[PDB]
Amino acid sequence: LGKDHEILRRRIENGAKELWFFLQSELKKLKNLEGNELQRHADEFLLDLGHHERSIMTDLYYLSQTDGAGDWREKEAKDLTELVQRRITYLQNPKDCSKAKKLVCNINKGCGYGCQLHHVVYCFMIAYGTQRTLILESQNWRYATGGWETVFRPVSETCTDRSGISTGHWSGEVKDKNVQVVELPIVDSLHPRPPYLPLAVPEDLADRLVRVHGDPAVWWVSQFVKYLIRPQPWLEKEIEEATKKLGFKHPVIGVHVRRTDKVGTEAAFHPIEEYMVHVEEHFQLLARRMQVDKKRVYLATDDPSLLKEAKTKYPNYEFISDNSISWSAGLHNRYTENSLRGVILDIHFLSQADFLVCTFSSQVCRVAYEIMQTLHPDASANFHSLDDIYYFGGQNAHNQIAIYAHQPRTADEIPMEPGDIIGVAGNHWDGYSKGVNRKLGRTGLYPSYKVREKIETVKYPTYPEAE
Amino acid sequence: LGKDHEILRRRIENGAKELWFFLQSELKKLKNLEGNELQRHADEFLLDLGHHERSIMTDLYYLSQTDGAGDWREKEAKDLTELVQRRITYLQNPKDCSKAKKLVCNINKGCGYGCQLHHVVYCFMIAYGTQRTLILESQNWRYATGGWETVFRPVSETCTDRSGISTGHWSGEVKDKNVQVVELPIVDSLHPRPPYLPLAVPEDLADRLVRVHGDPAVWWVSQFVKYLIRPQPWLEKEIEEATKKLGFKHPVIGVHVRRTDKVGTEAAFHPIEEYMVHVEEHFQLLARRMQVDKKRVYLATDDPSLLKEAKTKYPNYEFISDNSISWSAGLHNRYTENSLRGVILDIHFLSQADFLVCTFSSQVCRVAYEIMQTLHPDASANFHSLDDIYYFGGQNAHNQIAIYAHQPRTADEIPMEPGDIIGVAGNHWDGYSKGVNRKLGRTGLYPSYKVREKIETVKYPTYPEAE
Ligand SMILES: CC(=O)N[C@@H]1[C@@H](O)[C@H](O[C@@H]2O[C@H](CO[C@H]3O[C@H](CO)[C@@H](O)[C@H](O)[C@@H]3O)[C@@H](O)[C@H](O[C@H]3O[C@H](CO)[C@@H](O)[C@H](O)[C@@H]3O[C@@H]3O[C@H](CO)[C@@H](O)[C@H](O)[C@H]3NC(C)=O)[C@@H]2O)[C@@H](CO)O[C@H]1O
Ligand SMILES: Nc1nc2c(ncn2[C@@H]2O[C@H](COP(=O)(O)OP(=O)(O)O)[C@@H](O)[C@H]2O)c(=O)[nH]1
Ligand SMILES: Nc1nc2c(ncn2[C@@H]2O[C@H](COP(=O)(O)OP(=O)(O)O)[C@@H](O)[C@H]2O)c(=O)[nH]1
């Protein structure tokens, strides 16, 4: 056993104890306070708690690194990426294009870019599970009528032709076993649904993945995103240039303020302070472990009036942003090639950030979060969403398992017994989550710490000839 | 890397987050409450926090065990114990008694048993550091005129004769290099003081000790206590007998309520509820990890009237206590052979307990704490003292090092910069400790989590001839 590992574990153990002493002590005093005097000490209480908590969280990070834990996790996460990408490449490049089995996907989903991109990932996962090579029809793309290869490398190097001796619409893996080319519709109307869907992970990879990653469902998704967004040489250049011109350097926290048409339809308005309290909170955390030259925030928004307001309210923050891209995100100009390349860059610099604050209700932020997973080993915790937790549009039921019994204090809370299956709908970022105890058919609130993630696996193809 | 280790590490990391979310949420609500409504929600808050906190502490225990950590820690602590015990035996048993160098200790220190026993340990440790065999003059012992061998095996099997060609009082290890027999006074008057004192640990053992133990200073002390309290055969039997007769079985929490003459002179009165709130708290922690048939408490006190009061107020508790021993511990009868074996037995069963609640100001509880260290690997945390932190009467200055900067909010608090040496005076068990910033000569309070234990080492004999 490692000496540093033991010293850290004990320091974490003690930090929780001294925190518990501190909580009981100050709360006992708080019960005897009123009005103005109450609020001052309550605020001072929260101030001391923040540092105390971040001190514990810092040691928890150090524990995830000592005695080669960081080095090993980096190596193992590398092999998993290499392994999966190896299989996808093998699958995508058959020797004979005319005789390979193909699954056709059309990009023109009536929605934004992130929603459109996730439809392709959804297509890619099924083709992987069904041992079919992906053919992507991308003409008349609303962001770039030229097609997919306007910005990204083609999904295949040997088989982009869609021909085949038998073609039909999707009817199931078994029924379509003798159809060479299968046309896949969008997931919103898919019938029947196959097992090769989120949030399930490959049977053969689950054990290795959980050992490494804190949310293996996103990593499995991210591997298909990594492959898709292989840039054209000119796109790779534009990224490198924008990086230099914007002064993009670490440490930097990415922020995505989605507004315009999202407000009122799929999400709500969120003031700049709502995002920034978590940025400053995380910057305080980083300062506990490293020298912070400047507090950098890469702002990505479809509200161009925001950047000036952000600079004013936060003078000690260097905001890295391309305000002309924010204008390209406008509604009248959204579906053009220039706006497409703008959001691609915004997502890129968002994913490169050391931390990501946003609303996960927006498809835009979810992509940057997923791409972030391909850049670090187990980057699953490096975010804070203002509303929704992570999901994937069209996923199978996200389920948790109750580990501690809960008795409802109000009618808004549901009771839980250990073993009960809880269908989670989100986290309220206040200690409680909302869901339904499937056992009782009751929907309500419950303590977030009293449940546990139920990881699902699916018997995927392992593509051993890819080695 | 171990799979369970990572799952636990992630759970602990997340559990702290959800606690922080829970804290910020509920505290914001409390700022708008007064009087009865405030205290109701505040007390309900504390209840949720208690369970929430203990869940994290449970995971920390599970983390200290997975992937062979328990087996390895036990083996390494076994080797350390065996090694030290191996070395002590060699020192105490020279072939030629008349020619061996000896350190003579007189047991009749004007104080209680724990203080008297600790005086011998103080004597024993110096004899170890100076490569002298310990000679213990124990006749006219206030507890047993027969001497040390009334209850315990003699410290030596070959050399208990104090004869020697040269004898003199303590003047320092260097000056006494050619004095065969050196008479050691009590630590309260020792001049000059040698380095072989608490809380310093042997140089050659520090690396293995820190890897295993959370407070190696106590473990080093316990090794000399373990050797000393080897029981005479009649005592060894009675120990086994008392176990059966009392129904002593695990799980059990030991409690030591020292009163009578201690109040007003060296400590204060403490109600039974003061002890019992921590028992119930720790039993709830144990209940999270094991089946608890009955809540067992081994009560040890010199107040025999207490057991009735304790049984009354806590009907669902099984109180294991020998009320006649509490009576034998009475003031008029305290210094007799029967009372001696009573406190020896109380200390024994206290050390056997899974947890220890008491006042560390009493020498009695400190012994039970020290003996506990010889029964488990790193049993240093299985306690809660109502007043003093652990100390050893006559120790060199207990020092800590500030690791986080503190700015005084009041005048009662001291400022701290990282690296500052803080001479600690105690822990208030409320988030704050009391001490002196040696750098500034300022004494006051400071957050307990912002400091770190400064471990001290001292070149001690390796005693290779023993292996
Ligand atoms: C050889 C032998 O056994 N000598 C005993 C002698 O040591 C006892 O004195 C007590 O020693 C402890 C420990 O002292 C060490 O650590 C101290 C930390 O400051 C150093 O200053 C010192 O040099 C040693 O390294 C002291 O903590 C005790 O003082 C506490 O209790 C007395 C009352 O008896 C009180 O007046 C003091 O102010 C102090 O109070 C404690 O303070 C802490 C923090 O504020 C509280 O959490 C805790 O509740 C308080 N405890 C109590 C009991 O009030 C002693 O000086 C001596 C015991 O009387 O017996 C000798 O045999
Ligand atoms: N460049 C840029 N474009 C954005 C930003 N926010 C929204 N947009 C545009 O608005 C579209 C929103 O569509 P979508 O990706 O499906 O995600 P949604 O926010 O959940 O509707 C994006 O595709 C962009 O074209 C932003 O921060 N930067
Ligand atoms: N059997 C028994 N004796 C006790 C107990 N508490 C105190 N005594 C007696 O009181 C003495 C106190 O002396 P000492 O060990 O130096 O510790 P201190 O006076 O509490 O600091 C002990 O040695 C016992 O003889 C107890 O709980 N059980």
Tab-separated table of N, CA and C in Angstrom, chain A residues 258-363:
chain	number	residue	atom	x	y	z
A	258	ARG	N	-27.035	29.642	-23.446
A	258	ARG	CA	-27.981	29.451	-24.534
A	258	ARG	C	-29.243	30.257	-24.262
A	259	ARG	N	-29.617	31.108	-25.215
A	259	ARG	CA	-30.823	31.914	-25.073
A	259	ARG	C	-31.614	31.955	-26.374
A	260	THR	N	-31.910	33.160	-26.869
A	260	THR	CA	-32.715	33.346	-28.074
A	260	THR	C	-33.980	32.494	-28.042
A	261	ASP	N	-34.068	31.512	-28.943
A	261	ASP	CA	-35.279	30.713	-29.084
A	261	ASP	C	-35.382	29.593	-28.055
A	262	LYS	N	-34.285	29.256	-27.373
A	262	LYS	CA	-34.347	28.213	-26.353
A	262	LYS	C	-35.195	28.651	-25.164
A	263	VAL	N	-35.125	29.932	-24.799
A	263	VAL	CA	-35.894	30.432	-23.667
A	263	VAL	C	-37.376	30.354	-24.005
A	264	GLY	N	-38.167	29.812	-23.082
A	264	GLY	CA	-39.592	29.719	-23.271
A	264	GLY	C	-40.059	28.478	-24.001
A	265	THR	N	-39.164	27.771	-24.686
A	265	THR	CA	-39.538	26.602	-25.471
A	265	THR	C	-39.028	25.301	-24.873
A	266	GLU	N	-37.746	25.250	-24.517
A	266	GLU	CA	-37.123	24.042	-24.000
A	266	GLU	C	-36.317	24.296	-22.737
A	267	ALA	N	-36.208	25.547	-22.305
A	267	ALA	CA	-35.429	25.928	-21.137
A	267	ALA	C	-35.909	27.306	-20.693
A	268	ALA	N	-35.203	27.892	-19.741
A	268	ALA	CA	-35.569	29.179	-19.174
A	268	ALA	C	-34.399	30.145	-19.288
A	269	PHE	N	-34.679	31.410	-18.998
A	269	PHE	CA	-33.617	32.399	-18.918
A	269	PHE	C	-32.804	32.171	-17.651
A	270	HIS	N	-31.491	32.361	-17.758
A	270	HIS	CA	-30.592	32.208	-16.621
A	270	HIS	C	-29.655	33.409	-16.605
A	271	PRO	N	-29.699	34.242	-15.568
A	271	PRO	CA	-28.785	35.387	-15.488
A	271	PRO	C	-27.326	34.954	-15.495
A	272	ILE	N	-26.462	35.894	-15.886
A	272	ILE	CA	-25.030	35.616	-15.940
A	272	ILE	C	-24.498	35.239	-14.562
A	273	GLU	N	-25.060	35.827	-13.500
A	273	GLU	CA	-24.626	35.487	-12.149
A	273	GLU	C	-24.919	34.030	-11.812
A	274	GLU	N	-26.014	33.477	-12.343
A	274	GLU	CA	-26.339	32.074	-12.102
A	274	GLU	C	-25.204	31.158	-12.545
A	275	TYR	N	-24.657	31.395	-13.740
A	275	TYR	CA	-23.514	30.609	-14.192
A	275	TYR	C	-22.263	30.926	-13.385
A	276	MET	N	-22.026	32.209	-13.106
A	276	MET	CA	-20.722	32.638	-12.620
A	276	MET	C	-20.450	32.210	-11.185
A	277	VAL	N	-21.491	31.976	-10.381
A	277	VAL	CA	-21.256	31.533	-9.009
A	277	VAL	C	-20.557	30.181	-8.998
A	278	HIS	N	-20.869	29.315	-9.965
A	278	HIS	CA	-20.219	28.012	-10.040
A	278	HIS	C	-18.837	28.092	-10.675
A	279	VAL	N	-18.625	29.044	-11.586
A	279	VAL	CA	-17.286	29.267	-12.133
A	279	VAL	C	-16.336	29.719	-11.030
A	280	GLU	N	-16.696	30.804	-10.336
A	280	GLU	CA	-15.884	31.283	-9.221
A	280	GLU	C	-15.685	30.189	-8.181
A	281	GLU	N	-16.730	29.402	-7.924
A	281	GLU	CA	-16.615	28.304	-6.973
A	281	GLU	C	-15.542	27.316	-7.412
A	282	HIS	N	-15.528	26.965	-8.701
A	282	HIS	CA	-14.539	26.011	-9.191
A	282	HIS	C	-13.158	26.641	-9.314
A	283	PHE	N	-13.085	27.939	-9.615
A	283	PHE	CA	-11.788	28.608	-9.643
A	283	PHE	C	-11.173	28.660	-8.250
A	284	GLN	N	-12.007	28.830	-7.222
A	284	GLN	CA	-11.513	28.733	-5.853
A	284	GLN	C	-10.969	27.338	-5.574
A	285	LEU	N	-11.612	26.315	-6.140
A	285	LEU	CA	-11.138	24.947	-5.975
A	285	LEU	C	-9.781	24.749	-6.639
A	286	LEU	N	-9.637	25.217	-7.881
A	286	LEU	CA	-8.375	25.045	-8.593
A	286	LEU	C	-7.234	25.761	-7.883
A	287	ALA	N	-7.504	26.947	-7.332
A	287	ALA	CA	-6.474	27.689	-6.615
A	287	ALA	C	-5.924	26.909	-5.429
A	288	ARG	N	-6.690	25.955	-4.893
A	288	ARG	CA	-6.206	25.129	-3.793
A	288	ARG	C	-5.142	24.135	-4.233
A	289	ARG	N	-5.014	23.884	-5.539
A	289	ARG	CA	-4.096	22.877	-6.052
A	289	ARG	C	-3.097	23.400	-7.077
A	290	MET	N	-3.234	24.641	-7.543
A	290	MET	CA	-2.343	25.143	-8.580
A	290	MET	C	-2.326	26.664	-8.562
A	291	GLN	N	-1.261	27.220	-9.136
A	291	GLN	CA	-1.162	28.659	-9.335
A	291	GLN	C	-2.067	29.092	-10.482
A	292	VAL	N	-2.944	30.054	-10.212
A	292	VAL	CA	-3.883	30.573	-11.200
A	292	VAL	C	-3.428	31.972	-11.591
A	293	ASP	N	-2.908	32.108	-12.813
A	293	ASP	CA	-2.503	33.419	-13.311
A	293	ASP	C	-3.710	34.329	-13.508
A	294	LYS	N	-4.636	33.927	-14.379
A	294	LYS	CA	-5.826	34.706	-14.684
A	294	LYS	C	-7.031	33.783	-14.718
A	295	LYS	N	-8.165	34.279	-14.237
A	295	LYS	CA	-9.404	33.507	-14.268
A	295	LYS	C	-10.003	33.662	-15.658
A	296	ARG	N	-9.801	32.660	-16.506
A	296	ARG	CA	-10.258	32.707	-17.888
A	296	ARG	C	-11.584	31.980	-18.050
A	297	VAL	N	-12.487	32.597	-18.806
A	297	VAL	CA	-13.768	32.005	-19.160
A	297	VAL	C	-13.940	32.128	-20.666
A	298	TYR	N	-14.158	31.000	-21.335
A	298	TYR	CA	-14.530	31.013	-22.744
A	298	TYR	C	-16.048	31.079	-22.807
A	299	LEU	N	-16.573	32.247	-23.149
A	299	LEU	CA	-18.010	32.444	-23.226
A	299	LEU	C	-18.501	32.061	-24.614
A	300	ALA	N	-19.548	31.241	-24.655
A	300	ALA	CA	-20.180	30.817	-25.897
A	300	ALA	C	-21.675	31.029	-25.746
A	301	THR	N	-22.233	31.936	-26.544
A	301	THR	CA	-23.634	32.281	-26.394
A	301	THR	C	-24.212	32.659	-27.749
A	302	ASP	N	-25.533	32.545	-27.851
A	302	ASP	CA	-26.274	33.073	-28.985
A	302	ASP	C	-26.876	34.440	-28.688
A	303	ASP	N	-26.540	35.028	-27.538
A	303	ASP	CA	-26.929	36.391	-27.189
A	303	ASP	C	-25.694	37.278	-27.281
A	304	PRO	N	-25.499	38.011	-28.382
A	304	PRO	CA	-24.261	38.794	-28.537
A	304	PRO	C	-24.147	39.970	-27.584
A	305	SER	N	-25.263	40.482	-27.061
A	305	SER	CA	-25.220	41.580	-26.102
A	305	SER	C	-24.616	41.178	-24.764
A	306	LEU	N	-24.343	39.890	-24.557
A	306	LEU	CA	-23.918	39.405	-23.249
A	306	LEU	C	-22.465	39.748	-22.937
A	307	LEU	N	-21.575	39.661	-23.932
A	307	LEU	CA	-20.139	39.731	-23.656
A	307	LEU	C	-19.742	41.047	-22.991
A	308	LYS	N	-20.295	42.172	-23.455
A	308	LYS	CA	-20.007	43.455	-22.816
A	308	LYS	C	-20.485	43.466	-21.370
A	309	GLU	N	-21.705	42.979	-21.136
A	309	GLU	CA	-22.242	42.913	-19.781
A	309	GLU	C	-21.377	42.026	-18.889
A	310	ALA	N	-20.906	40.897	-19.424
A	310	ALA	CA	-20.069	39.986	-18.647
A	310	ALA	C	-18.743	40.639	-18.287
A	311	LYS	N	-18.110	41.306	-19.257
A	311	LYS	CA	-16.854	41.997	-18.989
A	311	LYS	C	-17.018	43.036	-17.887
A	312	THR	N	-18.134	43.771	-17.905
A	312	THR	CA	-18.353	44.836	-16.931
A	312	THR	C	-18.550	44.277	-15.526
A	313	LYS	N	-19.465	43.320	-15.375
A	313	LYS	CA	-19.789	42.811	-14.049
A	313	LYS	C	-18.648	42.012	-13.435
A	314	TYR	N	-17.710	41.528	-14.246
A	314	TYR	CA	-16.628	40.662	-13.780
A	314	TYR	C	-15.303	41.173	-14.326
A	315	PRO	N	-14.788	42.272	-13.765
A	315	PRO	CA	-13.568	42.869	-14.329
A	315	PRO	C	-12.332	42.008	-14.139
A	316	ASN	N	-12.273	41.195	-13.085
A	316	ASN	CA	-11.117	40.338	-12.864
A	316	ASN	C	-11.197	39.032	-13.639
A	317	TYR	N	-12.129	38.922	-14.579
A	317	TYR	CA	-12.238	37.760	-15.447
A	317	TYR	C	-11.847	38.148	-16.863
A	318	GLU	N	-10.972	37.352	-17.472
A	318	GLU	CA	-10.659	37.484	-18.888
A	318	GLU	C	-11.628	36.599	-19.663
A	319	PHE	N	-12.540	37.225	-20.399
A	319	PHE	CA	-13.520	36.496	-21.189
A	319	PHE	C	-12.980	36.314	-22.602
A	320	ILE	N	-12.790	35.063	-22.999
A	320	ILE	CA	-12.302	34.716	-24.327
A	320	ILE	C	-13.511	34.328	-25.163
A	321	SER	N	-13.821	35.132	-26.174
A	321	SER	CA	-15.019	34.889	-26.961
A	321	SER	C	-14.906	35.615	-28.291
A	322	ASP	N	-15.553	35.053	-29.302
A	322	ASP	CA	-15.607	35.639	-30.636
A	322	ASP	C	-17.015	36.207	-30.783
A	323	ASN	N	-17.158	37.503	-30.489
A	323	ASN	CA	-18.482	38.116	-30.485
A	323	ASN	C	-19.128	38.082	-31.863
A	324	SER	N	-18.324	38.053	-32.929
A	324	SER	CA	-18.898	37.947	-34.265
A	324	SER	C	-19.540	36.584	-34.484
A	325	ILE	N	-19.049	35.554	-33.791
A	325	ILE	CA	-19.691	34.244	-33.838
A	325	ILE	C	-21.037	34.286	-33.127
A	326	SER	N	-21.100	34.972	-31.983
A	326	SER	CA	-22.371	35.156	-31.291
A	326	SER	C	-23.417	35.768	-32.212
A	327	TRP	N	-23.001	36.704	-33.065
A	327	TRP	CA	-23.926	37.284	-34.035
A	327	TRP	C	-24.304	36.279	-35.113
A	328	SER	N	-23.357	35.433	-35.528
A	328	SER	CA	-23.679	34.399	-36.507
A	328	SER	C	-24.690	33.405	-35.948
A	329	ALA	N	-24.745	33.257	-34.622
A	329	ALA	CA	-25.728	32.382	-33.999
A	329	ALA	C	-27.138	32.961	-34.019
A	330	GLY	N	-27.315	34.193	-34.494
A	330	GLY	CA	-28.644	34.773	-34.596
A	330	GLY	C	-29.594	33.932	-35.428
A	331	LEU	N	-30.892	34.188	-35.236
A	331	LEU	CA	-31.910	33.319	-35.820
A	331	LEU	C	-31.983	33.468	-37.335
A	332	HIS	N	-31.905	34.702	-37.845
A	332	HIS	CA	-32.008	34.906	-39.289
A	332	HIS	C	-30.823	34.306	-40.035
A	333	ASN	N	-29.666	34.200	-39.382
A	333	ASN	CA	-28.436	33.749	-40.019
A	333	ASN	C	-27.943	32.410	-39.484
A	334	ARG	N	-28.762	31.695	-38.709
A	334	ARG	CA	-28.264	30.521	-37.996
A	334	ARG	C	-27.878	29.396	-38.948
A	335	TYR	N	-28.652	29.193	-40.008
A	335	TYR	CA	-28.468	28.028	-40.870
A	335	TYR	C	-27.692	28.424	-42.126
A	336	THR	N	-26.426	28.770	-41.891
A	336	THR	CA	-25.468	29.066	-42.946
A	336	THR	C	-24.144	28.407	-42.588
A	337	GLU	N	-23.258	28.309	-43.581
A	337	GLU	CA	-21.972	27.656	-43.352
A	337	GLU	C	-21.145	28.420	-42.328
A	338	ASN	N	-21.195	29.751	-42.373
A	338	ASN	CA	-20.426	30.551	-41.426
A	338	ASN	C	-20.898	30.308	-39.997
A	339	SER	N	-22.216	30.249	-39.790
A	339	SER	CA	-22.739	29.962	-38.457
A	339	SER	C	-22.423	28.538	-38.023
A	340	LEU	N	-22.409	27.596	-38.967
A	340	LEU	CA	-22.027	26.225	-38.647
A	340	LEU	C	-20.603	26.169	-38.108
A	341	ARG	N	-19.656	26.762	-38.838
A	341	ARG	CA	-18.270	26.775	-38.390
A	341	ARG	C	-18.087	27.589	-37.117
A	342	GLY	N	-18.985	28.537	-36.845
A	342	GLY	CA	-18.910	29.268	-35.591
A	342	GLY	C	-19.219	28.386	-34.396
A	343	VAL	N	-20.334	27.654	-34.459
A	343	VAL	CA	-20.714	26.801	-33.338
A	343	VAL	C	-19.752	25.626	-33.194
A	344	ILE	N	-19.188	25.137	-34.302
A	344	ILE	CA	-18.180	24.081	-34.212
A	344	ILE	C	-16.986	24.560	-33.396
A	345	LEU	N	-16.575	25.813	-33.603
A	345	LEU	CA	-15.452	26.357	-32.848
A	345	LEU	C	-15.835	26.602	-31.396
A	346	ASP	N	-17.017	27.179	-31.162
A	346	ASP	CA	-17.486	27.390	-29.797
A	346	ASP	C	-17.498	26.082	-29.019
A	347	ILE	N	-18.043	25.025	-29.625
A	347	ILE	CA	-18.053	23.714	-28.984
A	347	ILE	C	-16.630	23.234	-28.727
A	348	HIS	N	-15.736	23.436	-29.700
A	348	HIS	CA	-14.353	22.995	-29.545
A	348	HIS	C	-13.699	23.632	-28.328
A	349	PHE	N	-13.726	24.963	-28.251
A	349	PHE	CA	-13.063	25.633	-27.141
A	349	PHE	C	-13.783	25.368	-25.830
A	350	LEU	N	-15.090	25.099	-25.889
A	350	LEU	CA	-15.811	24.661	-24.698
A	350	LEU	C	-15.300	23.310	-24.213
A	351	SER	N	-15.137	22.354	-25.133
A	351	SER	CA	-14.685	21.021	-24.745
A	351	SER	C	-13.249	21.023	-24.229
A	352	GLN	N	-12.402	21.920	-24.736
A	352	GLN	CA	-11.015	21.960	-24.290
A	352	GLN	C	-10.869	22.525	-22.883
A	353	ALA	N	-11.888	23.217	-22.376
A	353	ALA	CA	-11.792	23.883	-21.085
A	353	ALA	C	-11.613	22.872	-19.956
A	354	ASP	N	-11.042	23.350	-18.850
A	354	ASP	CA	-10.822	22.514	-17.678
A	354	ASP	C	-12.096	22.258	-16.887
A	355	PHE	N	-13.181	22.955	-17.205
A	355	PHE	CA	-14.448	22.818	-16.503
A	355	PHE	C	-15.517	23.482	-17.356
A	356	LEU	N	-16.756	23.019	-17.206
A	356	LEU	CA	-17.835	23.431	-18.098
A	356	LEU	C	-19.077	23.751	-17.282
A	357	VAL	N	-19.512	25.007	-17.335
A	357	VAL	CA	-20.741	25.460	-16.690
A	357	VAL	C	-21.729	25.839	-17.783
A	358	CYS	N	-22.959	25.334	-17.678
A	358	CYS	CA	-23.960	25.570	-18.711
A	358	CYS	C	-25.326	25.043	-18.295
A	359	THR	N	-26.217	24.893	-19.269
A	359	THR	CA	-27.475	24.178	-19.102
A	359	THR	C	-27.432	22.947	-19.995
A	360	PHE	N	-27.555	21.764	-19.392
A	360	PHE	CA	-27.549	20.547	-20.193
A	360	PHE	C	-28.832	20.354	-20.988
A	361	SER	N	-29.854	21.184	-20.763
A	361	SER	CA	-31.030	21.136	-21.623
A	361	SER	C	-30.669	21.471	-23.065
A	362	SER	N	-29.639	22.292	-23.263
A	362	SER	CA	-29.183	22.648	-24.599
A	362	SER	C	-28.341	21.520	-25.180
A	363	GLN	N	-28.697	21.088	-26.393
A	363	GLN	CA	-27.917	20.066	-27.084
A	363	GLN	C	-26.475	20.510	-27.299
